[PDB]
Each structure stands twice: as C-alpha cells, then as structure tokens.
Amino acid sequence: AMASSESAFLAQHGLAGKTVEQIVDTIDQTPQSRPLPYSASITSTELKLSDGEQIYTLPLGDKFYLSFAPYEWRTHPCFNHSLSGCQGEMPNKPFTVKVTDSKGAVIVQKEMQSYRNGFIGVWLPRNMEGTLEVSYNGKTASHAIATSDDSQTCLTELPLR
Amino acid sequence: ASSESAFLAQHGLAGKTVEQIVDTIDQTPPLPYSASITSTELKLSDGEQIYTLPLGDKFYLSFAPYEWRTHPCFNHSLSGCQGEMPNKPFTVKVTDSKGAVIVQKEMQSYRNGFIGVWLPRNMEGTLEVSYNGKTASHAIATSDDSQTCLTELPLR
Numbered sequence: 353a354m355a356s357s358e359s360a361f362l363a364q365h366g367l368a369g370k371t372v373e374q375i376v377d378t379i380d381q382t383p384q385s386r387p388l389p390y391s392a393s394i395t396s397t398e399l400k401l402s403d404g405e406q407i408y409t410l411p412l413g414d415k416f417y418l419s420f421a422p423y424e425w426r427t428h429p430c431f432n433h434s435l436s437g438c439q440g441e442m443p444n445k446p447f448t449v450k451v452t453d454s455k456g457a458v459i460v461q462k463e464m465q466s467y468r469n470g471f472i473g474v475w476l477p478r479n480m481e482g483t484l485e486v487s488y489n490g491k492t493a494s495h496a497i498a499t500s501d502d503s504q505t506c507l508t509e510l511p512l513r
Numbered sequence: 514a515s516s517e518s519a520f521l522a523q524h525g526l527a528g529k530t531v532e533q534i535v536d537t538i539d540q541t542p543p544l545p546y547s548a549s550i551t552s553t554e555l556k557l558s559d560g561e562q563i564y565t566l567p568l569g570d571k572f573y574l575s576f577a578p579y580e581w582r583t584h585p586c587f588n589h590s591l592s593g594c595q596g597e598m599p600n601k602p603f604t605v606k607v608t609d610s611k612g613a614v615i616v617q618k619e620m621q622s623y624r625n626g627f628i629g630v631w632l633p634r635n636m637e638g639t640l641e642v643s644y645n646g647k648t649a650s651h652a653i654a655t656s657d658d659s660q661t662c663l664t665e666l667p668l669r
C-alpha cells in the first residue's frame with residue numbers, strides 16, 4: 353500500500369529507476385571525497401545501503417563486482433568494498449587491466465581509469481577463479497581472484513613493482 | 514535492519530541474486546506476499562509497504578502461449594489473470610532485429626502457465642514459441658518502458 357523507507361531512500365539519493373549495476377557504478381565512481389553522506393558497501397551478493405542505523409539490501413545480478421585499488425607505497429586491508437568510505441592511494445590514474453580465468457580465457461583486457469576514490473570496479477562472471485593483472489607506467493601487480501559467493505569484493509593487495 | 518531487509522530474510526530471498534529471486538517467485542509450484550515486475554525492477558509487497566529491488570543488466574519478459582482463450586496483460590505479477598497452459602513443453606526462439614538468434618531453448622511453462630526469459634536490454638526483435646507443430650510469434654522490445662508480460666501468443 354505505501355512506499356517503504358528503502359524505496360524512498362533510493363528516490364532521494366538519485367538511485368531510482370537504475371539497474372543495480374548502474375547504482376553500484378554510480379556510487380563507486382562518485383567524484384566526491386569520502387565519506388559520502390550515506391554508507392554503501394558491497395558483498396558477493398548484496399549492495400548494503402544506510403542513512404543511519406537502518407540498513408537496506410539490494411540483491412546483485414548475474415555478475416560479481418570486484419573493486420580493486422592498486423598502490424605504490426602503502427595499502428589497507430579490505431574484505432567487502434566500502435563504496436562510500438574508503439580511499440585508495442591512486443585516484444584518477446590510467447591503468448591497463450587484464451582478467452584471465454583458470455582455463456586461459458581473457459575476460460577483461462583494457463585501459464581503465466581509477467575513480468576519485470582510487471578504485472576500479474569490474475563486473476565478472478560468477479564462480480570463476482583466475483588472475484587479475486594491473487599495469488601502470490612500466491610497473492605491474494597481479495593477484496589470484498575468485499568470484500564465488502564467499503569471495504571478497506575488495507582487492508587492495510596490488511603493489512606495483 | 515529495515516522492513517525491507519527483514520522481508521527478504523523472512524521469506525528466504527536473502528543472498529539470492531535478483532534473477533534467482535524473480536525465477537523463484539515466477540516458478541513457484543501460494544506465496545504469502547505480492548510481487549510485480551517492471552522493465553527495471555521487482556516490486557514486493559506485504560500489504561502495508563512496497564519494496565523495490567532494481568533488476569540487473571537483463572530484461573525479464575514473461576509470456577503465456579495459448580490455444581483457445583487469452584487475457585490482456587501489462588506488467589507480470591502474481592495476482593491477476595493467469596496463463597492457460599501450465600507445465601507444458603515449448604520450444605522458444607528469440608531473434609533480434611539484425612537476425613542474431615538470442616535464445617533458442619526448450620522450456621517448461623510454470624504452474625501459472627507462464628515462461629520467463631532473460632533478454633539483453635534495448636533490443637527489438639521477434640519471439641517465436643512452438644508446441645506440437647503449432648507456432649506463435651510476436652514482435653518484442655526490451656526498452657526501459659516495455660511491458661514485462663506478453664499474452665498475445667495464439668498457437669496455430
């Protein structure tokens with residue numbers, strides 16, 4: 353009969369009518385310093401949103417979201433990515449990004465720009481295992497990744513050497 | 514925890530992707546809640562409040578082949594007029610405007626007489642359904658304002 357607080361939250365933060373990917377992309381890529389006015393974190397299966405004590409959960413779709421932040425000097429640990437609170441070391445930098453699965457298939461291969469928050473997000477098939485490689489100005493980092501339901505959505509262990 | 518998050522947990526929708534939730538609902542063999550799907554979201558209600566779950570990259574189209582009788586339908590929901598041919602085998606083909614075959618599958622209609630397909634967004638094309646040497650066809654589109662229910666499929 354009446355609009356939920358959850359539905360109203362969506363409407364007031366610019367998120368109504370968007371697909372869940374567009375919502376995640378919009379939030380992760382917002383060109384503001386952190387923290388954002390509301391909290392947002394992402395797991396293998398849910399986007400969690402909050403205006404205060406109260407939490408809304410939006411199911412993800414067919415694709416797993418991995419957000420990673422390459423670094424040169426220092427890093428911080430991360431399991432589920434905070435779209436609203438975390439700052440990576442390298443904002444607005446051009447990277448070359450390659451994701452390859454366990455049987456050699458290239459899933460991602462392109463030039464990507466890190467966001468204001470220093471992260472890059474990719475949308476990946478679920479239940480794969482593979483490798484992410486990142487490269488910047490002659491330097492590279494790589495790390496094993498997986499996209500099962502218990503896999504992390506945040507990868508910060510990418511020291512460029 | 515919000516009314517919304519609790520609702521999902523309580524009805525065992527927690528940790529499912531939005532496609533799994535839609536599939537579960539549409540394919541159920543008497544859900545204690547209401548549900549309606551649009552081009553861009555799933556609406557859920559407990560009768561007091563309405564929750565909205567954004568869909569993903571694919572459009573959900575639910576359709577009902579028929580032989581003798583049919584009913585008009587805008588967006589697909591649990592309530593309203595149901596389909597006509599429950600738990601039957603069909604062969605479903607979807608071709609896009611440039612002739613690419615998008616789906617070609619044998620699919621079983623659900624207890625409500627519908628079949629659901631997940632399609633790329635912003636495409637136009639044709640849906641064709643076969644059953645016992647009879648066929649039905651209809652133009653379809655998956656734009657942000659297209660309907661998610663198609664009942665105009667007379668098997669002939």
Ligand SMILES: [Cl-]
Nearest residue numbers: 358515516517
């Ligand atoms: Cl709510």
